[PDB]
């Protein structure tokens, strides 16, 4: 193909490499799934070794790991801290509660899955999913944003 197309593809690879090697989650959790999330932070699995480091403010966050039961009282707050994240942001639902309500699906005060509130990039199943499974979801998200072709789509526009 064109020489400029190759340059654009390599720039896409570089941008995707940077964004997948530096994934900072918001220090945000709701329940037992967030307990497994800090067990992923624990020395056995070392998200920091993978380059994944928690940041407290949503402004410095890249991904949002919805780890727990999203209730009706919590949903505006979750939407607010999602909206306050800057644009290259991703969402990892974790556990059956955040996926589709889970054990509290038919409850009066539970949002039936956080995908009703925020656009979810990756769903991690389990109750709780193990820290292995959450780490697998993080690596799958890294592959997904490695697959992104933003500058190539912009060039083909």
């Amino acid at each position: 193909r064109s020489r400029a197309e190759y340059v654009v593809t390599k720039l896409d690879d570089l941008i995707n490499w940077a964004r997948r090697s530096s994934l900072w989650p918001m220090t945000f959790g709701l329940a037992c799934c967030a307990v497994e999330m800090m067990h992923m932070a624990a020395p056995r699995y070392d998200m920091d070794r993978f380059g994944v480091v928690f940041r407290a403010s949503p402004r410095q966050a890249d991904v949002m790991i919805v780890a727990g039961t999203l209730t009706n009282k919590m949903a505006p707050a979750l939407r607010k801290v999602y909206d306050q994240m800057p644009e290259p942001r991703y969402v990892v639902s974790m556990g059956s509660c955040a996926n589709g309500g889970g054990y509290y699906h038919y409850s009066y005060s539970v949002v039936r899955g956080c995908d009703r509130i925020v656009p979810v990039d990756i769903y991690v199943p389990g109750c709780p999913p193990t820290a292995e499974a959450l780490l697998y979801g993080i690596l799958q998200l890294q592959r997904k944003i490695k697959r992104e072709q933003k500058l190539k789509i912009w060039y083909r526009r």
Binding site: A31, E36, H39, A42, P43, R44, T71, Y108, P128
Partner: protein, 360 residues
């Protein structure tokens, strides 16, 4: 930065757990208790199981009781690890969090080896426990526990005599004994204020009257005394774990009553009565005779209570869950008088607060 008023708005993790429990059967309502206090899963299982067993007028076998006490003490170690290390993380130090969470990973391996789930085991059930221990588990528990007191000594060296930690915890959130009793505190709060009270010693359950251990008692009622109490009862939990390993008896696992506990799978596949009872227990469940009880269990965070009301059917009519964190967070505003933001962070850390059991 002084704190004039604390207003804890809760219910942001409220999921209608009591209503779902009253719309499900007893065995179906068991794994909700894993998710009430998701650091004390086996302890809440034990509390609900003792409540249902009291309503059923049946007792679990002694081997089941010893297994339940052993895993209750393992769970107490897990919860006090979480409380102490995340309290230290809120203060500012995270290395004990990392070390003790590696230890938590080993205890999660024990949980997975007995139940298949690392956290929400659903292992302790009315009538005993779900399955017997796999071979070598007691040896691995011994190998973990013989090395664990050194790790506690490591955290204690890191924090206890540290003048920074003493400045952050000493004379912070001082609670008098009469105020703790009136505010309805339980567990670590009462013993930190100096009240000689422990449910495992006063109203014992399972084989806690057969094990022997000491009760840590504070004298100043502050964050430092509560932290010392939690570390010392971690050591006492290790002592009880040693006693349980040495005195684990042989025998069965569930109560030998197929109208409450399900039979073995071989018996179900070879016997008509066992197949009928398996069918009825896993479809309708056992009928609990009508009556009300309040069963209180010394959870790691305090007194975990279940007020169960049974209407005579196979579903509970009412299940009120009493969490110690509810009363502690109600008393948070009193403890924060004349304090700052970092002091409030320390008080929230030292109250041993989890919100699933608070909100339900």
């Amino acid at each position: 930065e002084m704190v004039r008023k604390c207003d804890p708005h809760i219910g942001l993790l409220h999921r209608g757990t009591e209503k779902l429990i009253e719309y499900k059967t007893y065995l179906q309502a068991l794994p909700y208790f894993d998710r009430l206090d998701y650091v004390s899963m086996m302890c809440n299982e034990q509390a609900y199981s003792i409540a249902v067993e009291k309503l059923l007028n049946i007792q679990p076998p002694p081997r089941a009781q010893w297994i339940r006490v052993l895993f209750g003490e393992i769970t107490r170690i897990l919860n006090h690890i979480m409380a102490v290390t995340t309290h230290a993380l809120d203060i500012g130090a995270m290395t004990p969090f990392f070390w003790m969470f590696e230890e938590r990973e080993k205890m999660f391996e024990f949980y997975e080896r007995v139940s298949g789930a690392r956290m929400h085991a659903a292992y302790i059930r009315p009538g005993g426990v779900h399955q017997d221990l796999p071979l070598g588990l007691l040896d691995d528990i011994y190998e973990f526990s013989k090395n664990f007191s050194l790790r506690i000594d490591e955290v204690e060296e890191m924090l206890t005599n540290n003048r920074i930690w003493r400045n952050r915890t000493v004379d912070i959130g001082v609670v008098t004994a009469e105020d703790a009793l009136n505010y309805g505190f339980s567990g670590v709060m009462l013993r930190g204020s100096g009240i000689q009270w422990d449910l495992r010693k006063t109203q014992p359950y399972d084989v806690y009257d057969q094990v022997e251990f000491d009760v840590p008692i504070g004298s100043r009622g502050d964050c430092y005394d509560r932290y010392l109490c939690r570390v010392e009862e971690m050591r006492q939990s290790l002592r009880i774990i040693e006693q349980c390993l040495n005195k684990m008896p042989p025998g069965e696992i569930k109560v030998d009553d197929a109208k409450v506990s399900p039979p073995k799978r071989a018996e179900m596949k070879t016997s008509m009565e066992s197949l009928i009872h398996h069918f009825k227990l896993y479809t309708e469940g056992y009928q609990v005779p009508p009556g009300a009880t309040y069963t209180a269990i010394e959870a790691p965070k305090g007194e975990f209570g279940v007020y169960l009301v049974s209407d005579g059917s196979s579903r509970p009519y009412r299940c009120k869950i009493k969490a110690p964190g509810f009363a502690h967070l109600a008393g948070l505003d009193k403890m924060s008088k004349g304090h700052m933001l970092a002091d409030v962070v320390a008080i929230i850390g030292t109250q041993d607060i989890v919100f699933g059991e608070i909100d339900r």
